[PDB]
């Protein structure tokens, strides 16, 4: 008997840890090389000093985990190494229950390869994997602490829930019906955190000096100071100066990573050798591409339109309940005022009879997926749904991905 | 007087905002009755007053209300909680 091991195989960072553990660890799954050729692996990227022109290589080419070599390398680093990760040690893998996650739309052959490697190269006793939205309904089984906001004012799983998974690759609209997502209503919004970073790259390269090669610098800039307009784009542009912030450029002799200052608040003087970049319009005009892709000259439709289409493709009787039970998760949702704007803009388009309740977890929203996944792993539903090693051996490789995990069963 | 048109527009715009909000339509409440002599007849007006349909409205309201009472008896403890059942949500929508 052993508690299951839960891993969130994200394309940007990997959340993992024993089910008994309270909060998971982090693993930035990317093999990076510097200008001079020295290579860095996973969390060691945080130890780079010449942040200028480091190149990131990832196994998820476009949300699909293609290159398996480095994926296995980062899995080995994250699981086997006990020194860095607080003494946790996956000794042999055999006789260990593993619950994983994957992109909701993975090619059948790619999923076949994934199941094959995870079953036979590592020899886990049992496995269950699915997109994070599949684990979302199991928030009923535990006493979660997630703040909720309604858009109309200023048996261990919920049957009806709608999940907006805005992560690194794409923003997903996954409506789940009693556990199985209605895969016909699954809609992909191509806008995501990676595109957001690229847009910040272009805007900062034009407005200020060329930052077209400072990928980690702009990533930290997006991390620290960004927001969706609390009311509307026009309102934020009217008060652009009042909410302006300035970002301190990196100083290699003192701080490898930069930091942001609030000019209005009283704070320490900067040394005269420090270069400063002011942000007055890129703070809010970049996140607005979720609602108005036309601002950044993108022909793709916005998030509200994707949600509307996903609701339209749903059965008529259930769509109002789906509207009422929309829950947000993913890395992008932690930026301020995104949930409120989503709720208000969605309510403005729905019939007055319906009311939309938007619930977003507090704290870092990236860790919510792992939390709900782990809390599901410790329930009888996980015990029933899991597939055993000998059962996998009994069937052909395609059987698992075509029947028990992949979309091919529910399509 | 052509040069004074802008002033007139500004003043009228200033006054309309306060004028429109807190006024009672005296025409709607039959407080104004000097135009009625032009297009209305005495016996026609008294016949329309006698032929009012208040009873039909009251009886239909009572019929709908007793149907709602029966529906509430069937449903039981009504609540506005977040909906997790098609039956419960549909019945609440019917009630509203």
């Amino acid at each position: 008997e052993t508690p299951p091991i839960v891993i969130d195989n994200g394309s940007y960072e990997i959340k993992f840890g024993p089910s008994t553990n309270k909060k998971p660890f982090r693993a930035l799954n990317a093999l990076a090389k510097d200008k001079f050729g020295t290579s860095y692996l996973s969390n060691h990227i945080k130890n780079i000093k010449d942040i200028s022109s480091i190149t990131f290589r990832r196994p998820h080419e476009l949300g699909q985990l293609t290159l398996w070599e480095l994926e296995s390398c980062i899995w080995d680093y994250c699981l086997f190494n006990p020194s860095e990760f607080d003494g946790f040690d996956l000794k042999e893998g055999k006789g260990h229950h593993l619950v994983a996650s994957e992109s909701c739309m993975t090619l059948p052959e790619l999923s076949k390869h994934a199941d094959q490697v995870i079953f036979e190269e590592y020899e886990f006793d049992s496995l269950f994997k699915s997109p994070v939205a599949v684990f979302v309904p199991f928030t009923k089984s535990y006493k979660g602490e997630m703040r909720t906001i309604s858009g109309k004012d200023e048996s261990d799983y919920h049957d009806f829930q709608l999940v907006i998974d805005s992560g690194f690759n794409c923003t997903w609209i996954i409506p789940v019906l009693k556990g199985i997502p209605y895969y016909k209503a699954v809609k992909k919004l191509d806008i995501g955190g990676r595109f957001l970073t690229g847009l910040l790259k272009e805007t900062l390269s034009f407005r200020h000096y060329n930052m077209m090669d400072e990928t980690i610098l702009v990533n930290n800039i997006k991390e620290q100071c960004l927001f969706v307009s609390p009311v509307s784009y026009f309102d934020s542009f009217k008060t652009k100066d009042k909410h302006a912030l300035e970002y301190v450029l990196p100083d290699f002799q003192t701080s490898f990573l930069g930091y942001v200052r609030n000019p209005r608040k009283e704070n320490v003087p900067l040394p005269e050798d420090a270069q400063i970049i002011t942000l007055t319009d890129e703070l809010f005009t970049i996140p607005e591409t979720f609602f108005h892709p036309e601002i950044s000259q993108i022909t793709k439709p916005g998030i509200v339109e994707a949600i509307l289409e996903s609701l339209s493709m749903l059965p008529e009787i259930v769509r109002p309940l789906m509207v009422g039970n929309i829950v947000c998760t993913g890395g992008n949702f932690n930026l301020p005022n995104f949930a409120q704007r989503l709720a208000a803009e969605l309510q403005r388009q729905l019939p007055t009879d319906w009311t939309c309740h938007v619930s977003v977890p507090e704290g870092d929203c990236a860790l919510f997926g792992w939390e709900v996944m782990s809390q599901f792993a410790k329930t009888d539903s996980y015990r029933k749904a899991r597939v055993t090693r000998e059962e996998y051996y009994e069937h052909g490789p395609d059987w698992c991905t075509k029947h028990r995990f992949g979309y091919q069963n529910w399509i | 007087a052509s040069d004074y048109k802008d002033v007139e527009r500004t003043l009228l715009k200033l006054f309309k905002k306060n004028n429109q909000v807190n006024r009672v339509d005296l025409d709607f409440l039959n407080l104004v009755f000097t135009l009625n002599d032009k297009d209305l007849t005495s016996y026609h007006a008294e016949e329309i007053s006698k032929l009012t349909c208040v009873k039909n409205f009251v009886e239909e309201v009572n019929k709908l209300r007793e149907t709602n009472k029966q529906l509430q008896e069937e449903f039981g403890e009504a609540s506005f909680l977040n909906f997790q059942d098609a039956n419960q949500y549909f019945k609440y929508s019917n009630k509203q």
Partner: peptide, 15 residues
């Protein structure tokens, strides 16, 4: 009402 009958037949995390 018949849509509810159709909805109840949907899979419920089984097969």
């Amino acid at each position: 009402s018949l849509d509810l009958s159709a909805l109840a037949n949907f899979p419920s995390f089984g097969e």
